[PDB]
């Protein structure tokens, strides 16, 4: 059996997509994956046992200039490699227009997908041969894996769910796990940001236990910020640009994380890392991290410069002390 995935985007919800796999893999002996994802995500795919052939897209690079004439030929080619095998089924886990008709109608097989009262948006359910309703009030992981389960014919199973992608990095942890945190600070909206003397005076509070502490990035105004939380204490190391398996190799040797509400955030936890989330104006709820010790640390006030750096170390120690 041969199943194609359509989940593109964001980060995290090509992440949360992994248990349902997994789940697939132990009900139907020998299911294999292709897996039609943008292409900043495409290594994600490649880490879990039951995936075969990425089949990378770049909507939202095409959308500046669809009709430019390389772009209409990357289209032309993305058709052509998505119509090259007739598969048992297409899940459509996004539920968007765009993944809808400019993926999913285009396939050959069976195409499932989220009905007009769960979809995201309601008219991607015009593209399916078999609508299924998934409610929409339980996690995202919970979601995908009631689809995949009613698309593929099994029963879902009521364990939690297991991303099953660690095990690809046991064979490249670094030589110093272990004796390593890793901060994320970079997000997506100012007001999910954890302020800068925050972060600074938790760095502060952690000069006595001769813990190092590692800051990635992936844009020019987050290596500035990096920098900036790093300035003046040695034990933490500003990390060179790397590709988003080498930072997943370095998530997954780290004792613990502290992150803001973000995607490498939800990596963090498809790594089964202890990972402390701090939240303002999100809810952790439906979008919160799903995994093995993923902790919640709520602002006061949902406002994260009320949040401080003591809080947030007796959080850390309040949760040791298991
Ligand atoms: C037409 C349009 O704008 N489509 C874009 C869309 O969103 C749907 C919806 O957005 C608004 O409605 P809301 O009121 O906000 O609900 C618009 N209305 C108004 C009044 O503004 C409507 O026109 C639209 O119908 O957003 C996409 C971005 O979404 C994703 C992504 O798939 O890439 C997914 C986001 O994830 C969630 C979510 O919060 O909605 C939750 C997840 O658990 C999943 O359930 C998932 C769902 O399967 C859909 O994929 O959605 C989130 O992760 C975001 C990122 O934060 C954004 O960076 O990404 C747009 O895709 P693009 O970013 O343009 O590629 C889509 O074009
Ligand atoms: C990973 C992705 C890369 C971009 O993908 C686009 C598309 O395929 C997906 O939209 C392409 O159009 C584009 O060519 C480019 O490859 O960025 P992101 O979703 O914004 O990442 C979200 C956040 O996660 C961080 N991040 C993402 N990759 C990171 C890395 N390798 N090291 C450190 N941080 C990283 C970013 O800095 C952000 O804060």
């Not at 509070?205 to 040695?234: N, T, V």
């Not at 979008?287 to 010790?293: H, L, P, Q, V």
Request: charged share 25%.
């Amino acid at each position: 059996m041969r199943v194609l995935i359509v989940k593109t985007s964001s980060m995290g919800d090509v992440l949360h997509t992994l248990p349902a796999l997994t789940d697939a893999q132990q009900a139907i002996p020998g299911i294999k994956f292709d897996w039609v994802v943008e292409e900043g995500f495409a290594q994600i795919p490649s880490w879990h046992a039951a995936v075969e052939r990425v089949i990378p897209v770049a909507i939202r690079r095409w959308r500046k200039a669809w009709f430019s004439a390389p772009i209409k030929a990357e289209r032309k080619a993305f058709r052509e490699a998505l119509q090259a095998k007739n598969y048992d089924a297409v899940i459509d886990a996004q539920g968007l227009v765009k993944s809808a008709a400019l993926v999913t109608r285009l396939a050959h097989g069976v195409k499932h997908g989220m009905d007009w009262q769960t979809a995201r948006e309601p008219l991607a359910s015009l593209f399916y041969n078999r609508k299924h309703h998934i409610a929409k009030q339980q996690h995202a992981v919970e979601r995908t894996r009631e689809l995949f389960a009613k698309s593929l014919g099994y029963s879902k199973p009521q364990t939690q769910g297991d991303y099953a992608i660690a095990q690809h990095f046991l064979t490249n942890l670094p030589t110093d796990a272990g004796e390593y945190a890793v901060f994320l600070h970079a997000t997506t909206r100012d007001d999910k940001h954890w302020p800068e003397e925050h972060w600074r005076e938790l760095i502060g509070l952690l000069a006595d236990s001769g813990i190092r502490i590692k800051l990635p990035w992936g844009a020019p105004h987050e290596e500035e910020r990096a920098k900036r939380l790093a300035e003046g204490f040695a034990y933490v190391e500003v990390l060179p640009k790397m590709s988003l398996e080498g930072v997943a190799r370095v998530l997954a040797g780290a004792k613990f994380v502290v992150s803001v509400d973000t995607g490498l955030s939800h990596l963090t936890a498809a790594l089964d890392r202890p990972n402390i989330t701090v939240y303002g104006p999100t809810d952790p709820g439906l979008i919160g991290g799903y995994g093995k010790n993923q902790m919640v640390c709520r602002a006061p006030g949902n406002e994260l410069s009320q949040l401080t750096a003591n809080a947030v170390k007796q959080f850390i120690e309040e949760n040791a002390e298991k």
